[PDB]
Design a binder for this molecule. Structure first.
Ligand SMILES: CN(C)C(=O)Cc1c(C(=O)O)n(Cc2cccc3ccccc23)c2ccc(F)cc12
Ligand SMILES: [Zn+2]
Length: 226
């Protein structure tokens, strides 16, 4: 998160910290969010050979009683995810057991409504990602308020599509999701409407988020069958 604030500790109890293992490099990291006691939603580009989930964190360097370190038993990457275009950048993680409900750990289920969110409003995104181009990942959960932009603001991303994705962050400001924030939720009036997907290496906003409303049928299908 660039240009944001430290979150009040445990104030976003659905937030998930993901460690992603591959066979031929060290760990990579993403965010995510708990939508059922045994399901985390995140980005498809966060898939790996194996994933660990930590719920209940604020400072990810200091173990505390709120932590729940949970095993993932299966990854459900969107079947039409495209590594070239990055269309359909969405994935569900099924946890081996249901998480415990505590003050610091809780679900964020979707409301029944799945209305298309137009440009114009402010929304908030949280993550443990880098706080600038040359800066390491944050040890503490950070958050920032960002403007939903008209789709023409994201035209330079030649594979961006308005139907599939949100365009997030006023280009006149530095405020943005960035590397290490992948898979984290964008909340608009307390409702998850986006997932951090990608943007520019040089951090100039806007960035591209998966538009959750488009994927609600798929999410429902996976949850009901598993
Ligand atoms: C498992 N991970 C994490 C990786 O493989 C590295 C990775 C990241 C990242 O580091 O988070 N992001 C997000 C990202 C990248 C570049 C610039 C961005 C500017 C804004 C927002 C997000 C940005 C990816 C998007 C597509 C992809 F195929 C891979 C990645
Ligand atoms: Zn604590």
């Amino acid at each position: 998160i660039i240009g944001g604030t430290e979150s009040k500790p445990h104030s976003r109890p659905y937030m998930a910290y993901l460690e992603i293992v591959t066979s031929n490099g060290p760990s990579k990291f993403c965010g995510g969010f708990l939508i059922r006691r045994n399901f985390v939603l995140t980005a498809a580009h966060c898939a790996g050979r194996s994933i660990t989930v930590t719920l209940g964190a604020h400072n990810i360097t200091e173990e505390e009683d709120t932590w729940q370190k949970l095993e993932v038993i299966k990854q459900f990457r969107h079947p039409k995810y495209n590594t070239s275009t990055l269309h359909h950048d969405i994935m569900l993680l099924k946890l081996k057991e249901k998480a415990s409900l505590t003050l610091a750990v809780g679900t964020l289920p979707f409301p029944s409504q799945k209305n298309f969110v137009p440009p114009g409003r402010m929304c908030r995104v949280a993550g443990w990602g880098r706080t600038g181009v040359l800066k390491p990942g944050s040890d503490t959960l950070q958050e920032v308020k960002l403007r939903l932009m008209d789709p023409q603001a994201c035209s330079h991303f030649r594979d961006f599509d308005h139907n599939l994705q949100l365009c997030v962050g006023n280009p006149r400001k530095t405020k943005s999701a960035f590397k290490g924030d992948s898979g984290g939720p964008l909340l608009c009036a307390g409702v998850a409407q986006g997932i951090v997907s990608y943007g520019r290496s040089d951090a100039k906003p806007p960035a591209v988020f998966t538009r959750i409303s488009h994927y609600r049928p798929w999410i429902n299908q996976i949850l009901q069958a598993n």
